[PDB]
Symmetry: D2
Subunit: 125 residues, 4 copies
């Protein structure tokens, strides 16, 4: 099994009130669902990603990332977000991320296609 397979697997909540439900595989796979509290989103969306299944043992976090394309049976926002970050274990376990949200645009509007931000996920709230 992956070192933080147990630590990562489960339900996570960010500062916006969004819900991230993920299963970490022994090989490095992340699969689950994402529900955003904001934006052009309704209900759950598929996510997939990857994590470092053999992280450093020096107190460093565990690198990971995942993607959601914002299409499900209720809604299509013609966009995708990727979160890139690290898992930090312990009593106050966290996933600290930065994200890039790209919308489909014409070539003329591609300069304004991509939003950037940061989400912190915790096991409570």
């Amino acid at each position: 099994m992956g070192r933080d397979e147990a630590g990562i697997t489960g339900t996570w909540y960010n500062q916006l009130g969004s819900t991230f439900i993920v299963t970490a595989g022994a090989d490095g796979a992340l699969t689950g669902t994402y529900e955003s509290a904001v934006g052009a989103a309704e209900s759950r969306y598929v996510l997939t990603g990857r994590y470092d299944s053999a992280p450093a043992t020096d107190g460093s976090g565990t690198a990971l990332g995942w993607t959601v394309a914002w299409k499900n049976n209720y809604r299509n926002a013609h966009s995708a977000t990727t979160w890139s970050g690290q898992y930090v274990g312990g009593a106050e376990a966290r996933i600290n991320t930065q994200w890039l949200l790209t919308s489909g645009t014409t070539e003329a509007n591609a300069w304004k296609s991509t939003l950037v931000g940061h989400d912190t996920f915790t096991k409570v709230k």
Copy 2:
């Protein structure tokens, strides 16, 4: 099938000489392998991601993203990159992306954990 399922599936090359091999599923799945020409990388790494399988029909690109965790049997760089971007079809087809590369760090070094950049992928070179 997804609108750009055929357009996205295949081999792509970026400005650094890296090779992105991807299969787009009808549902929105991206699976494949990534080989970086630079950095702490050797040979192929698993990737997974998502794309908008029903994009707009107004000339807009197709939003997508994917993740690579930089661990395989040869090397572990304790890091993950996510690419967020859009596919643009046509004779000069492209995937234009921005990326976030997070390394596992201690809490003290988390401020310097994340690199940002941009890759443009084409079907040739």
Copy 3:
């Protein structure tokens, strides 16, 4: 005078313990000094930037940005950070930012030249 000239001018502190001392001009100028609690930095560095001197009156924040090149008489880290964000007034006044920190690199290493992060500045601590 600028709408938030009074609100912006002064001393600000971020989550890392860094100190941002700024004067906002009536025209949109930002001038001052920055002292980082982390990284390849010692003592104060010159900063300059700009802010929207006539922001919206709908409860929106006030857009602004500034730059520090990390050279002073004590130290040169061959790098520059830009912070881009907005000022939010009130009892819990804040400047919420995202930043890009570019280091001078060879062309071969340019892909790994730029760090990204986020700082929140407040009037206390």
Copy 4:
């Protein structure tokens, strides 16, 4: 004088057709005007920034950054862009940047306040 004071000072053009006119001071100051070919912009805007006036001599680029707040006598877009990058000298001299464009928003919309992109500036076109 700064090592690349002469190299940086002048007129630069990016891939969008925007015009960046800058004077580099011996101390590290950047002052000038910016004219964007795209977005909510008309004519010239004030810019200010900083550069490393004593860069490395190992073939590395010269770190720099600057800010434009998008208010002038013609237009106010309640936003600011910061460019962070490096100057690379030679026959094909370039300023390679990444940028963050923050708009003033309500707290509810702050998650979608910031665009990210990349501009490459050259002395011709």
